[PDB]
Design an enzyme around this catalytic site. Sequence first.
Site, PDB file in Angstrom:
ATOM      1  N   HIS A  14      -6.492  11.425   9.824  1.00 59.34           N
ATOM      2  CA  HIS A  14      -5.627  12.587  10.050  1.00 59.34           C
ATOM      3  C   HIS A  14      -6.375  13.739  10.707  1.00 59.34           C
ATOM      4  O   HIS A  14      -7.524  13.991  10.402  1.00 59.34           O
ATOM      5  CB  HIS A  14      -5.027  13.073   8.729  1.00 59.34           C
ATOM      6  CG  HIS A  14      -4.244  12.021   8.024  1.00 59.34           C
ATOM      7  ND1 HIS A  14      -2.938  11.727   8.352  1.00 59.34           N
ATOM      8  CD2 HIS A  14      -4.600  11.151   7.051  1.00 59.34           C
ATOM      9  CE1 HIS A  14      -2.521  10.722   7.598  1.00 59.34           C
ATOM     10  NE2 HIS A  14      -3.512  10.354   6.803  1.00 59.34           N
ATOM     11  N   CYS A  65       5.973  10.231   6.149  1.00 56.75           N
ATOM     12  CA  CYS A  65       4.505  10.144   6.183  1.00 56.75           C
ATOM     13  C   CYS A  65       3.843  10.985   5.067  1.00 56.75           C
ATOM     14  O   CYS A  65       3.589  12.197   5.225  1.00 56.75           O
ATOM     15  CB  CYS A  65       3.969  10.563   7.561  1.00 56.75           C
ATOM     16  SG  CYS A  65       2.207  10.212   7.804  1.00 56.75           S
ATOM     17  N   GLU A 122       2.772  10.811  14.338  1.00 59.50           N
ATOM     18  CA  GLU A 122       2.207   9.590  13.774  1.00 59.50           C
ATOM     19  C   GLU A 122       1.359   8.830  14.777  1.00 59.50           C
ATOM     20  O   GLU A 122       1.626   8.834  15.979  1.00 59.50           O
ATOM     21  CB  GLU A 122       3.296   8.666  13.223  1.00 59.50           C
ATOM     22  CG  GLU A 122       3.943   9.167  11.922  1.00 59.50           C
ATOM     23  CD  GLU A 122       4.328   8.031  10.970  1.00 59.50           C
ATOM     24  OE1 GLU A 122       4.002   8.112   9.764  1.00 59.50           O
ATOM     25  OE2 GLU A 122       4.943   7.047  11.425  1.00 59.50           O
ATOM     26  N   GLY A 124      -0.036  11.820   5.380  1.00 64.15           N
ATOM     27  CA  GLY A 124      -0.104  12.968   6.279  1.00 64.15           C
ATOM     28  C   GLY A 124       0.047  14.264   5.518  1.00 64.15           C
ATOM     29  O   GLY A 124      -0.693  15.217   5.751  1.00 64.15           O
ATOM     30  N   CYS A 175       0.797  -1.227   0.000  1.00 66.29           N
ATOM     31  CA  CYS A 175       0.000   0.000   0.000  1.00 66.29           C
ATOM     32  C   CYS A 175       0.837   1.289   0.000  1.00 66.29           C
ATOM     33  O   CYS A 175       0.873   2.041   0.978  1.00 66.29           O
ATOM     34  CB  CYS A 175      -1.074  -0.011   1.100  1.00 66.29           C
ATOM     35  SG  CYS A 175      -0.475  -0.206   2.774  1.00 66.29           S
TER      36      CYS A 175
END
Lengths: 288, 293
Positions: free
Chosen positions: A176, A227, A225, A230, A84
């Site tokens: 997030h 990234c 966390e 993010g 992923c």
Amino acid sequence: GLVPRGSHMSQFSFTKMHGLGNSYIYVNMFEEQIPEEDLALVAEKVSNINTGIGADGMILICPSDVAPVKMRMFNNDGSEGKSCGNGLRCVAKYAYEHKLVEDTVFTIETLAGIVTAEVTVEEGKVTLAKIDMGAPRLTRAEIPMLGEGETPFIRENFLYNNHRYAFTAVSMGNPHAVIFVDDVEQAPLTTLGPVLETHEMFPERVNVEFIEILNEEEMNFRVWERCGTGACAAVVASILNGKMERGKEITVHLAGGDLMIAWTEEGNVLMKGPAEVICRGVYEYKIE
Amino acid sequence: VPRGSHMSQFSFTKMHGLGNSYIYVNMFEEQIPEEDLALVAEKVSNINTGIGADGMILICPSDVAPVKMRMFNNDGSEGKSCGNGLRCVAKYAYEHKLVEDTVFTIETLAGIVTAEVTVEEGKVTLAKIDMGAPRLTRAEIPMLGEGETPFIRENFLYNNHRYAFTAVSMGNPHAVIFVDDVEQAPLTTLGPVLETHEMFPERVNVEFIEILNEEEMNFRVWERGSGVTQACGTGACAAVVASILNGKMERGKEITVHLAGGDLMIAWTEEGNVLMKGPAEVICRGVYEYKIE
């Protein structure tokens, strides 16, 4: 079945490359050979820092019936799983530079499905690879987040230490919470990050991003966390708040380096990031 | 005030002895400025942005031996190895024809070391290193209290059991405890409480050993500063000295120590010096690329 006896000694050429976060051992299965039944074990051996090279795992660049190259990712415990995202910028770099692909835009077959890659070539070398990170998800249930209120998007205040913060909730496949700061250096990262991470209203916890918007195409970025998802969430949050524009490449300054992100008017968030060679060589091993 | 940047690269070989691994660089063939060594060691040892190792070992020209070993830890500090990497250096030196013979010397920061390689089919399978004489005084450990005649052995009460340790220095402090089964040694529990006990002001490495017979033992160690390690060479030597002191083993006999990471063959010679023989393995060889801004 069979209880094996004997031993075998082999080797293969490899490249260690680093993109965003992880670093893997890359093996070109067009030129190298590892028996199928040895892959999981070789992945474990080579990822070990003490008795191997040292990596988060091993990625095979292989022939494909449906794309120019296929990516197979093994973790450092030998288990094969979905990348992923991880390793794609490095696979794209390698594919192009070793001429397994003939254009800057091309496809890669992964476990999840076929993926588009677009490399930036600067002096015959790939510097950046652009990948599709999908559409954000802006609903409470999709974050996931408890409470009510998602129109036009999720923005909630948060009292911490006699000061009203405001975060914007976004899922990029993972949760997030994006807070805007005036000065990123005095962001309550060690202090507000952790307590907001595990707040009741986030059943599955949350990644906490503090960002300072420099202008309409530039921001500095720190994450606590849970990234590149993010940095995408952070960009999507600035566009939702009117700080930035849709369909424009915004450059995010992380602690690592730069990611270049655009929330396309089409819907997808496209992310452009670096890939680098650490070393190349020949790895030798014995299986008994 | 430095400015600009350099992109450079060097060939390397990652090797390990009992799973303590380093990046080896041949400095007869390679160039790295002195002022970059600490930074390169740190960079290259990092598993994320580097190769991944316990540090970097330079194999260098010497005024006093065929080769000189310089060792850098993964924080860039240059230091004494206490035995680490000497067998891989010996293997490397012999196979890359930096020496003419199976017996030779290596210059180290701790002094000049004798090395003897076992060659089998053009390759070095084992290297035997002089680890020097043990030091058995309290002041040499270093340690508090009084009494080292004929050597240091203390009782220790912990968790309603009575243990006893023998104290030995091979250049670094060791407390050797004898057990009936190393698999149930109080390694993670008694290890750290004795490591940091006030009678060891510089701390101590705590070894647990099972004597299987008179030429053979099992070995585990709680390392000072680290914890449970696969392979502590100085500690294995300490352990063999400790068992000879306690009358459980003979001086001059080659004793096989089964550590977690593999076997080591150790003799406390009658001359006084302790000789340690063990494996050395190539993991990979290659070119490492780096940038310094």
